[PDB]
Each structure stands twice: as C-alpha cells, then as structure tokens.
C-alpha cells in the first residue's frame, strides 16, 4: 500500500513447461478461497486434533492442511520444501501458500508450525519429531502427500529418479505440447528393472513407513492415530502409465506398505489407508505423459456435468465422507476413494470418444485447454478473483518460527 519501490508488478511468465514467476497476493487469496470452501459445510466434528502433513505447501497436501485446521479445528505441523524470498527474487508458490496458511491460522487461534527441508532426510524427521514434542506432544493424524521426482536415500546416499514408463512393451501416447500448443505423440520404451526399482524408491511407500516408524519410536504417535498417503489411479485412458507401468509398481508398493502400517496402528485402535484422489493440474503436469490432454478433456466433460472440482473439494470430502465418516467410500484393496466423479462411466466414455479426435486446429474448442492453462496459472497465484494484478505486491513475506 505504501508506495514502495520494493513492491513489484508481477505477471505470469511460462517458459517451456514451468511458470517462473509467482504472485504472492494471488497465492494468499487462493488459500483464503480454500478456507472459505471448507467453511461452507461448517465444522468437521469428531475429526483429528493434532495433524502432521508431509508435503503441506501445495496441491492436495495444502488442501489437507487447510481442511484439517479450518475444518476440524486441528493444530497442524506441515513439512515442505520451498524457496524463501531472497534478494528481491520472490519465493516459490508453496512458500506464499504456507505463509498465508500461517497468517489465517494465527488469526483464528489454530496452532501452526512448519518445517522447510527434505522430508526424505533423517535430519528433517528428527527436527519434525522435536517440533511435535515441543508443540503437540503427539499427533493423531499423519498425512503423506509428497510428490518429488527424485529421492536421495537417507541410508545409502543414492539419488533415485522416478520415471513414467510402461512395462513389458513400448507405448505411444497422444498429448499436448503445452509450449507449442499442439498435439504430439510420445513414444515411451518399457522401463528397465533399474528404472522400476528407482521409481518404487521415490514414489513407493518406504519413506512413509520410515516416517511412521520414527514417529512411533520417538513416542509422538498417539494411540488411535490414523495415517493416509495420497495417490492417483485414474481409469482406462491413462492405465498403461499410471497403473501398469513403473509408476504402477510404486503404487503397488504403497498398497503393500499400508497393510503393515495398519497392522502396526490397529493395536491401539488406529488405522492406515491409501486415499485415491482425482486428476488435477499440478506444477509438473505440463511435462508428464498424457496429462495435459487428459485433463483438458476431463475438465471439459465434467464441467458440462457440473461435477468439476479441484484439490480442496476432493480433500474436504475425503475427510468428511471417508477418513472420518461412518460410511466411507472403499475399494477392493481397502483404499479410500474420493475419485468417484472422475470415474463416472458417462464421463470416461466421453473422454475416450474424444481422445483421438483432438487436433492442432480444434485444441481449444474440442477440449478445455483454456481451463487447463488457467488452472496451471492458479498454482502460481495468477488469475485469482479479487486480486488486482496491476497493483504492486511485496515479495518479501516471512513465515514465523519456520524450522529449517
């Protein structure tokens, strides 16, 4: 408000597949909209009171932190990995999201602590444990929502890289080049055994298990505690990659991991579940196989049915209907499901029918590619209602008592 040169006019800048700018005011307004959504259905009674969210700064993890805090009234500890604002170079979106979370939480009286560092590392587990002991005593819910392309193993020091490839045979997948805004095909060779192993190391359940084991050993997991890890399964359109490919092997590891975790927690009346959520735009969406095309089509079809929604709607429902509801949506493997609207048969049929019909010429009219691009920019604080993008904004935003 004070006319300061330190305030910046920040416009979206997409280079290749990533947005290199971030709007602090837009991020905060987005956090406020999510808080407002949770307030629509009011309080979440009989919910968790002391919640750890691993991967708490963006997407589903941020939505979980918001629903738990502003919905259930829970104190929260969030772990994330974000860049702080520095020498007039703004931070990452997740930084501003978490700062805004902190501001809103502080105003309401909801206790909030955050840890910024590599959640895969022992040092961060140790610091998070100390913070729980200091602020919470014990946690009654642990949400695991980490989506990292690589993992430096805490024991071996090996850096594992995740790969999105089919298994057994090559596949050829239609998609959108979001940079050139055109249809393309990507030929993907079958994953090697090393690629499969590395993908499991990054995206499977080992780190989640290490978290639970360490929390429990330190005595900071409450009797009756629940833990859930978020994932995506989708349906036929993307199954070669997201269900049967290298990523599928990581998800199978999550399913195996949760059975042991559940056995561990069930003794004291707790539980562990994999929760399956719908497809949404994420920061990595534009670079990964199939997704911009699949999302553009899915958005078109679900908007037409009035069932389109994003992270906060999904997670608020998951918490109310299933994780803390008396009639949870459960599948054959025992996963909690929030993705029913995506799996609607008429929805899947329409996406499938349109899949091979998209061309360079009809990209914008046959799909909701505009909506994909708008939701991509929302991740970085752009295009949010009520924000004046012509007004200068302060990049240097602090997070109180951040642990690093």
XYZ file of N, CA, C and O in Angstrom, residues 232-346:
460
model
N -3.048 -41.312 -7.046
C -3.978 -41.226 -8.166
C -3.993 -42.567 -8.879
O -2.931 -43.132 -9.127
N -5.171 -43.082 -9.218
C -5.235 -44.301 -10.033
C -5.785 -44.059 -11.429
O -5.343 -44.688 -12.396
N -6.774 -43.178 -11.534
C -7.397 -42.913 -12.824
C -8.113 -44.128 -13.389
O -8.510 -45.033 -12.657
N -8.273 -44.143 -14.703
C -9.059 -45.173 -15.367
C -8.356 -45.599 -16.643
O -7.144 -45.470 -16.759
N -9.127 -46.081 -17.611
C -8.537 -46.741 -18.768
C -7.630 -45.866 -19.618
O -6.610 -46.332 -20.111
N -8.004 -44.606 -19.802
C -7.258 -43.728 -20.697
C -5.770 -43.693 -20.380
O -4.945 -43.766 -21.284
N -5.426 -43.637 -19.091
C -4.038 -43.468 -18.673
C -3.413 -44.714 -18.020
O -2.324 -44.642 -17.448
N -4.082 -45.859 -18.125
C -3.674 -47.025 -17.331
C -2.295 -47.607 -17.683
O -1.650 -48.182 -16.814
N -1.840 -47.460 -18.933
C -0.532 -48.024 -19.334
C 0.614 -47.439 -18.513
O 1.646 -48.080 -18.302
N 0.435 -46.195 -18.088
C 1.463 -45.486 -17.349
C 1.118 -45.454 -15.872
O 1.930 -45.818 -15.026
N -0.093 -45.012 -15.559
C -0.406 -44.678 -14.179
C -0.900 -45.864 -13.367
O -1.051 -45.753 -12.152
N -1.113 -47.005 -14.026
C -1.493 -48.229 -13.321
C -0.609 -49.467 -13.590
O -0.274 -50.190 -12.655
N -0.239 -49.716 -14.845
C 0.575 -50.886 -15.185
C 2.072 -50.612 -15.394
O 2.864 -51.547 -15.510
N 2.460 -49.346 -15.463
C 3.848 -49.009 -15.749
C 4.703 -48.901 -14.502
O 4.336 -49.425 -13.458
N 5.846 -48.230 -14.607
C 6.750 -48.103 -13.463
C 6.053 -47.420 -12.283
O 6.217 -47.815 -11.131
N 5.267 -46.387 -12.574
C 4.502 -45.721 -11.526
C 3.518 -46.674 -10.835
O 3.359 -46.639 -9.612
N 2.869 -47.532 -11.616
C 2.009 -48.559 -11.061
C 2.703 -49.449 -10.038
O 2.107 -49.833 -9.032
N 3.967 -49.778 -10.285
C 4.734 -50.588 -9.334
C 4.944 -49.869 -8.002
O 4.948 -50.502 -6.938
N 5.168 -48.564 -8.066
C 5.272 -47.748 -6.867
C 3.946 -47.734 -6.110
O 3.922 -47.780 -4.892
N 2.837 -47.661 -6.832
C 1.530 -47.668 -6.173
C 1.215 -49.026 -5.544
O 0.602 -49.106 -4.473
N 1.664 -50.100 -6.185
C 1.503 -51.412 -5.598
C 2.306 -51.493 -4.297
O 1.897 -52.154 -3.338
N 3.447 -50.817 -4.266
C 4.245 -50.801 -3.045
C 3.529 -50.047 -1.922
O 3.607 -50.440 -0.749
N 2.828 -48.970 -2.278
C 2.021 -48.235 -1.299
C 0.954 -49.134 -0.704
O 0.718 -49.106 0.510
N 0.295 -49.926 -1.551
C -0.735 -50.834 -1.064
C -0.163 -51.874 -0.087
O -0.809 -52.243 0.899
N 1.041 -52.359 -0.370
C 1.651 -53.375 0.483
C 2.123 -52.740 1.781
O 2.010 -53.338 2.857
N 2.613 -51.512 1.667
C 3.143 -50.774 2.804
C 2.035 -50.489 3.812
O 2.220 -50.647 5.013
N 0.870 -50.088 3.310
C -0.226 -49.676 4.179
C -0.778 -50.858 5.013
O -1.245 -50.677 6.134
N -0.705 -52.066 4.475
C -1.166 -53.240 5.227
C -0.356 -53.442 6.517
O -0.917 -53.746 7.576
N 0.957 -53.243 6.428
C 1.842 -53.316 7.587
C 1.626 -52.135 8.522
O 1.615 -52.283 9.735
N 1.472 -50.951 7.951
C 1.197 -49.766 8.749
C -0.114 -49.912 9.515
O -0.210 -49.497 10.669
N -1.114 -50.517 8.876
C -2.418 -50.679 9.506
C -2.300 -51.665 10.662
O -2.866 -51.446 11.726
N -1.549 -52.740 10.449
C -1.325 -53.717 11.497
C -0.632 -53.099 12.695
O -0.947 -53.410 13.842
N 0.317 -52.212 12.422
C 1.049 -51.512 13.471
C 0.116 -50.632 14.303
O 0.166 -50.645 15.534
N -0.754 -49.886 13.627
C -1.625 -48.927 14.300
C -2.926 -49.496 14.858
O -3.509 -48.912 15.773
N -3.383 -50.616 14.303
C -4.663 -51.202 14.685
C -4.654 -51.682 16.134
O -5.698 -51.746 16.779
N -3.471 -52.024 16.632
C -3.317 -52.485 18.006
C -3.936 -51.505 19.005
O -4.643 -51.909 19.931
N -3.679 -50.217 18.800
C -4.197 -49.181 19.685
C -5.435 -48.512 19.089
O -5.814 -47.412 19.491
N -6.063 -49.172 18.122
C -7.309 -48.677 17.570
C -7.148 -47.636 16.473
O -8.105 -46.940 16.125
N -5.946 -47.531 15.914
C -5.727 -46.625 14.791
C -5.909 -47.299 13.439
O -6.381 -48.426 13.358
N -5.522 -46.625 12.363
C -5.749 -47.181 11.026
C -4.777 -46.551 10.030
O -4.201 -45.508 10.304
N -4.566 -47.211 8.897
C -3.781 -46.640 7.809
C -4.470 -46.967 6.495
O -4.954 -48.084 6.308
N -4.525 -45.985 5.591
C -5.184 -46.162 4.300
C -4.425 -45.411 3.231
O -3.870 -44.339 3.488
N -4.429 -45.962 2.027
C -4.118 -45.183 0.834
C -5.416 -44.485 0.439
O -6.486 -45.116 0.388
N -5.346 -43.182 0.184
C -6.525 -42.457 -0.308
C -6.308 -42.089 -1.772
O -5.286 -41.495 -2.126
N -7.272 -42.432 -2.620
C -7.156 -42.166 -4.045
C -7.978 -40.929 -4.436
O -9.188 -40.863 -4.187
N -7.313 -39.969 -5.070
C -7.934 -38.688 -5.418
C -8.023 -38.538 -6.940
O -7.430 -39.332 -7.674
N -8.763 -37.531 -7.401
C -8.939 -37.296 -8.843
C -7.726 -36.610 -9.481
O -6.844 -36.092 -8.788
N -7.707 -36.596 -10.815
C -6.696 -35.873 -11.586
C -6.920 -34.363 -11.473
O -8.037 -33.877 -11.690
N -5.854 -33.630 -11.135
C -5.876 -32.160 -11.135
C -4.618 -31.645 -11.806
O -3.669 -32.397 -12.012
N -4.610 -30.363 -12.166
C -3.391 -29.760 -12.653
C -2.402 -29.611 -11.493
O -2.775 -29.166 -10.410
N -1.150 -29.987 -11.730
C -0.072 -29.743 -10.770
C 1.085 -29.041 -11.465
O 1.053 -28.839 -12.684
N 2.114 -28.683 -10.702
C 3.247 -27.952 -11.267
C 4.002 -28.772 -12.305
O 4.653 -28.221 -13.185
N 3.908 -30.088 -12.190
C 4.640 -30.991 -13.075
C 3.798 -31.490 -14.249
O 4.310 -32.181 -15.131
N 2.516 -31.127 -14.255
C 1.541 -31.654 -15.211
C 1.935 -31.474 -16.668
O 1.680 -32.352 -17.501
N 2.534 -30.330 -16.986
C 2.773 -29.989 -18.387
C 3.887 -30.811 -18.997
O 3.991 -30.911 -20.222
N 4.703 -31.414 -18.138
C 5.874 -32.156 -18.585
C 5.628 -33.658 -18.649
O 6.373 -34.374 -19.315
N 4.586 -34.133 -17.968
C 4.346 -35.579 -17.847
C 3.420 -36.132 -18.940
O 2.633 -35.382 -19.541
N 3.545 -37.442 -19.230
C 2.771 -38.110 -20.285
C 1.254 -37.999 -20.131
O 0.716 -38.140 -19.027
N 0.588 -37.735 -21.251
C -0.865 -37.758 -21.347
C -1.617 -36.648 -20.615
O -2.676 -36.263 -21.053
N -1.088 -36.147 -19.502
C -1.928 -35.390 -18.572
C -2.560 -34.078 -19.068
O -3.735 -33.838 -18.807
N -1.788 -33.217 -19.755
C -2.476 -32.015 -20.222
C -3.642 -32.342 -21.173
O -4.668 -31.679 -21.099
N -3.489 -33.340 -22.034
C -4.601 -33.739 -22.909
C -5.749 -34.357 -22.101
O -6.918 -33.985 -22.269
N -5.414 -35.308 -21.231
C -6.419 -35.948 -20.401
C -7.136 -34.924 -19.528
O -8.365 -34.896 -19.484
N -6.379 -34.061 -18.847
C -7.013 -33.027 -18.032
C -7.904 -32.081 -18.859
O -9.011 -31.742 -18.434
N -7.415 -31.643 -20.018
C -8.195 -30.716 -20.847
C -9.536 -31.328 -21.253
O -10.560 -30.653 -21.243
N -9.520 -32.609 -21.588
C -10.748 -33.329 -21.929
C -11.633 -33.579 -20.710
O -12.846 -33.380 -20.760
N -11.021 -34.034 -19.622
C -11.760 -34.335 -18.402
C -12.462 -33.088 -17.875
O -13.630 -33.146 -17.490
N -11.741 -31.966 -17.845
C -12.325 -30.700 -17.405
C -13.527 -30.341 -18.287
O -14.584 -29.981 -17.784
N -13.363 -30.422 -19.601
C -14.495 -30.113 -20.496
C -15.726 -30.952 -20.147
O -16.845 -30.440 -20.010
N -15.508 -32.245 -19.971
C -16.629 -33.168 -19.782
C -17.302 -33.028 -18.415
O -18.531 -33.042 -18.306
N -16.499 -32.910 -17.364
C -17.052 -32.769 -16.023
C -17.702 -31.397 -15.787
O -18.716 -31.296 -15.099
N -17.117 -30.339 -16.342
C -17.752 -29.019 -16.241
C -19.145 -29.059 -16.861
O -20.101 -28.471 -16.341
N -19.261 -29.780 -17.962
C -20.549 -29.901 -18.635
C -21.571 -30.629 -17.758
O -22.770 -30.373 -17.848
N -21.089 -31.523 -16.899
C -21.964 -32.265 -15.996
C -22.132 -31.579 -14.640
O -22.924 -32.025 -13.812
N -21.392 -30.496 -14.416
C -21.448 -29.784 -13.152
C -20.677 -30.454 -12.024
O -20.917 -30.174 -10.848
N -19.739 -31.332 -12.366
C -19.028 -32.088 -11.333
C -17.539 -31.789 -11.245
O -16.809 -32.454 -10.506
N -17.078 -30.811 -12.010
C -15.674 -30.425 -11.971
C -15.306 -29.903 -10.577
O -16.088 -29.190 -9.944
N -14.131 -30.273 -10.091
C -13.641 -29.705 -8.831
C -12.149 -29.939 -8.707
O -11.553 -30.635 -9.524
N -11.541 -29.334 -7.693
C -10.102 -29.414 -7.536
C -9.708 -29.976 -6.184
O -10.463 -30.731 -5.572
N -8.523 -29.600 -5.723
C -7.946 -30.178 -4.509
C -8.796 -30.015 -3.258
O -9.049 -30.988 -2.566
N -9.209 -28.790 -2.941
C -9.893 -28.586 -1.665
C -11.230 -29.345 -1.606
O -11.579 -29.904 -0.580
N -11.964 -29.394 -2.712
C -13.234 -30.105 -2.703
C -12.990 -31.589 -2.456
O -13.709 -32.247 -1.703
N -11.971 -32.108 -3.117
C -11.637 -33.515 -3.032
C -11.254 -33.905 -1.613
O -11.725 -34.912 -1.073
N -10.395 -33.102 -1.006
C -9.852 -33.469 0.297
C -10.853 -33.231 1.429
O -10.947 -34.026 2.360
N -11.610 -32.143 1.334
C -12.672 -31.878 2.299
C -13.657 -33.056 2.297
O -14.048 -33.553 3.350
N -14.048 -33.511 1.112
C -14.926 -34.665 1.018
C -14.285 -35.930 1.560
O -14.921 -36.708 2.278
N -13.017 -36.147 1.219
C -12.303 -37.326 1.705
C -12.330 -37.363 3.229
O -12.582 -38.399 3.835
N -12.059 -36.219 3.847
C -12.009 -36.154 5.307
C -13.388 -36.375 5.923
O -13.527 -37.162 6.850
N -14.402 -35.682 5.405
C -15.763 -35.813 5.938
C -16.413 -37.165 5.644
O -17.054 -37.752 6.517
N -16.275 -37.636 4.406
C -17.025 -38.803 3.943
C -16.335 -40.106 4.309
O -16.998 -41.122 4.525
N -15.007 -40.102 4.356
C -14.304 -41.382 4.409
C -13.279 -41.558 5.521
O -13.317 -42.553 6.243
N -12.355 -40.615 5.661
C -11.333 -40.767 6.688
C -11.961 -40.624 8.079
O -11.578 -41.336 9.012
N -12.926 -39.707 8.209
C -13.667 -39.502 9.458
C -15.185 -39.584 9.284
O -15.936 -38.924 9.996
N -15.627 -40.395 8.333
C -17.047 -40.578 8.101
C -17.448 -41.998 8.432
O -16.604 -42.893 8.463
N -18.737 -42.206 8.682
C -19.230 -43.508 9.111
C -19.587 -44.406 7.927
O -19.708 -45.618 8.081
N -19.747 -43.814 6.746
C -19.895 -44.610 5.526
C -18.880 -44.200 4.464
O -19.209 -43.478 3.520
N -17.629 -44.665 4.630
C -16.505 -44.344 3.745
C -16.610 -45.035 2.384
O -17.136 -46.145 2.295
N -16.115 -44.376 1.340
C -16.032 -44.983 0.019
C -14.765 -45.839 -0.022
O -13.658 -45.306 0.016
N -14.922 -47.164 -0.058
C -13.766 -48.068 -0.023
C -13.716 -49.012 -1.229
O -14.755 -49.472 -1.709
N -12.517 -49.316 -1.724
C -12.420 -50.253 -2.841
C -12.004 -51.656 -2.382
O -11.917 -51.916 -1.185
N -11.739 -52.542 -3.339
C -11.446 -53.945 -3.055
C -10.110 -54.144 -2.335
O -9.925 -55.130 -1.615
N -9.182 -53.216 -2.548
C -7.868 -53.292 -1.935
C -7.905 -52.639 -0.551
O -6.958 -52.753 0.233
N -9.012 -51.970 -0.242
C -9.143 -51.290 1.035
C -8.666 -49.842 0.962
O -8.350 -49.230 1.981
N -8.615 -49.274 -0.237
C -8.251 -47.862 -0.335
C -9.486 -46.990 -0.137
O -10.602 -47.403 -0.453
N -9.286 -45.784 0.381
C -10.373 -44.820 0.455
C -10.441 -44.142 -0.908
O -9.406 -43.847 -1.508
N -11.652 -43.901 -1.398
C -11.823 -43.314 -2.720
C -12.547 -41.974 -2.679
O -13.653 -41.871 -2.133
N -11.937 -40.954 -3.275
C -12.599 -39.660 -3.418
C -12.850 -39.345 -4.891
O -13.389 -38.285 -5.233
N -12.476 -40.281 -5.753
C -12.403 -40.020 -7.183
C -13.618 -40.485 -7.989
O -13.559 -40.529 -9.213
N -14.723 -40.800 -7.312
C -15.895 -41.358 -7.992
C -16.410 -40.498 -9.150
O -16.800 -41.031 -10.177
N -16.396 -39.179 -8.987
C -16.919 -38.288 -10.024
C -16.107 -38.384 -11.320
O -16.667 -38.314 -12.410
N -14.797 -38.571 -11.201
C -13.945 -38.782 -12.375
C -14.228 -40.129 -13.042
O -14.137 -40.260 -14.266
N -14.579 -41.123 -12.230
C -14.775 -42.474 -12.725
C -16.201 -42.695 -13.220
O -16.549 -43.810 -13.602
N -17.027 -41.650 -13.183
C -18.375 -41.735 -13.718
C -18.301 -42.307 -15.134
O -17.483 -41.873 -15.941
N -19.127 -43.320 -15.423
C -18.980 -44.034 -16.695
C -19.256 -43.169 -17.924
O -18.578 -43.342 -18.932
N -20.226 -42.263 -17.850
C -20.510 -41.389 -18.989
C -19.350 -40.403 -19.197
O -19.041 -40.017 -20.322
